[PDB]
Structure 1
């Protein structure tokens, strides 16, 4: 009656079409010229494809919105998806729901999703997209601005295309302390951040069973680190194998260090930075050396008394300053084949050396055959 007319009006205003451009589905109805079709049973409306000739009549309309007519067939659900004409179902993944059409969206805490798999799709209460098929072609597909924001925020850059081809995640290989929220002002204690940054590269346990265990850590993927601010730390940093450290330029008699590492421990009878050398214990196991004065001898390495875990380490322009009184700057122990360029230790704080930010002993090295220090300062 008038109900049909006022509804057509409601539907039309929603899609931006004309009242006459809306047709109700019914077996045998002429589909020609109409822009939108309304299923009175499900009470859902769908844009019709352009091209239905006059005289083409309706045969059937599935609950998944598949429309069959005298001239052929068409998935109104897929068409709706392509046109971003969606219905956001009540509830959520948490409440559970049942999906019947490709253009139905279910809300999750991080945005909306459509189901690209077999329909109907039942979602049990307490669900998540991961627990109900996962994401991707044939499963759950993220839809809408809210889910785009969360995806970009929690992603790895794979949504960002780059030239000549590929995506952003393909070319981001360098790490920074900023990824770990290091303050970088040389005041705040950035120790935990620096250690996590290194641990994420090569996390080697301080105690290990045998030689095969220790040696295994020299066989991992190497990663480059870029230090562009000033990081104050308070405990000896142990560089694991497979680490490349980089800084734009090297210090040269600089009064105020602005980029690099600042060692400021409570215990000054220690080293700022050390390579990893494992020492044999009575039980037969091995423990990372933490003793400041220790250095392995060739004998120690032959006795099995020591096992180095310092390989594939490269340094470019690292600047290291220390609080006055610190015993040792860098312990280059067991670093065979390891290399350095522009390693710069100590700060030219001022005229009085007793208060200058430099160590008593700059560098201590042993068991480092084939190592090269280029332009060390």
Structure 2
């Protein structure tokens, strides 16, 4: 005989399974199926449902997905269930351990409004069926809508050494690690085994940075699409002032990156050795008042006013293959490293265009060398004296 004390549960008096408690009847079956993992469902050629379910979705966490409800806590929980990295770690060993976890794929099929910077932990693959392209109304992806706009929508994880030798997660929007920081231990990257395939990211107007791709060595992207082609008034368009900011990401590849921006499209700083940006399509949403934008992250030597599609400095030497750059005051601003002019400016066959032939310069090169191959597409501005 089996004695069951008052206040017992099947889980606390032997568990459910052979030799212990066995579910019997329809009510039990319903609950067993409702709270299971799919192991009760057989599949072909063999095995069970749980054997083949490997992707995660925000819907598993009850995200509304209408771009209205604040789905922040659900997105964080989904991410946490994959790799939950504490914001303060004791030492280098602890932070590095988080890059050694199981990687999981996430599928985003609706629109998720969020209001705090999302930090992607290592071991995360994100996918959406197709990438946005000058899309008028984003229907799938992420919509950053914070109170504090002096922030980034998405950011990779980089830990900064504290006075006591401990490491805290970086949460400063303007911060980016340098090759020096990584070398001398002041910064430790916690960004690896991260893959993006078609992520659409829109932001409330005025958000400072779309994506902070910091410390993402070896991390890859395909079809990353930033910003919404909301309408003619860029002042109210759902796109960030700065699309992407990247540093310490050697060996990182961005394939067919799409960026709609207001102030700066993409910025690459410091160590990005061997990184490539192929077939990028980076455009300001029209060039109305573009000449009045003030670059946010730029080398000291660049003091001109005007929006910049691609900015690179401090020794960064990303390879730009066949980029398409539209409606920019400055297509490219590139400065070599201050010390020795290191950092080759490399652009192969840029497709440069601007409505009404409005432009200041295509290649604003500072203290540097370059190899550029033109493809018969381009122009110089309307000012007969200063544009070239």
Q: Normalised by the shorter chain, which TM-score bucket?
A: 0.5 to 0.7
Aligned to 1:169: 50
* 1:136 Cα deviation from its structure 2 partner: 1.7
Q: Give the aligned partner of residue 7 of structure 1.
A: none
Match of residue 308 from structure 1: 189
Aligned to 1:322: 203
Query: Does 1:138 find its partner at 2:24?
Result: no
Residue 273 of structure 1 is matched in structure 2 by 154
State the TM-score, normalizing by the size of structure 1: 0.68
Equivalent in the alignment of 2:226: 345
Bigger fraction of residues in helix: 1
CA shift digits 1:332-376 (9 cap, x unpaired): 000000000000000001111111111111000000000000000
Q: 1:266, 1:184 → 2: CA distance?
A: 20
Query: What corresponds to 1:366 in structure 2?
Result: 247
Counterpart position of 2:38: 157
User: Aligned ranges for residues 227-306 of structure 1 at < 5 Å?
Assistant: 227-306=108-187
User: Which residue pairs with 1:216 in the alignment?
Assistant: 97
2:269 matched to which residue of 1?
none
Deviation of 1:151 after TM superposition, in Å, equals 0.3
Q: Partners in 1 of 2:34 and 2:86 — Cα distance?
A: 32
1:181 aligns with 2:62: yes
TM-superposition CA deviations, 1:158-184 (whole Å, max 9, x none)? 111110111111111100000110010
State how many pairs are aligned: 258
Larger radius of gyration: 1
* Partners of 2:110 and 2:202 in 1: CA distance: 13
Alpha-carbon separation, structure 1, partners of 2:110 and 2:34: 24
Deviation string, structure 1 residues 173-202 (Cα, Å, up to 9, x no partner): 100000110010001111111011101100
Partner deviation per Cα, 1:233-288 (whole Å, 9 max, x = no partner): 11100000000000000000000000000011111111000000000010110010
2:202 aligned counterpart, secondary structure: strand
RMSD: 0.8
Equivalent residue for 2:6?
125
Query: Using the alignment, how far apart are the partners of 2:230 and 2:10 within structure 1?
Result: 58
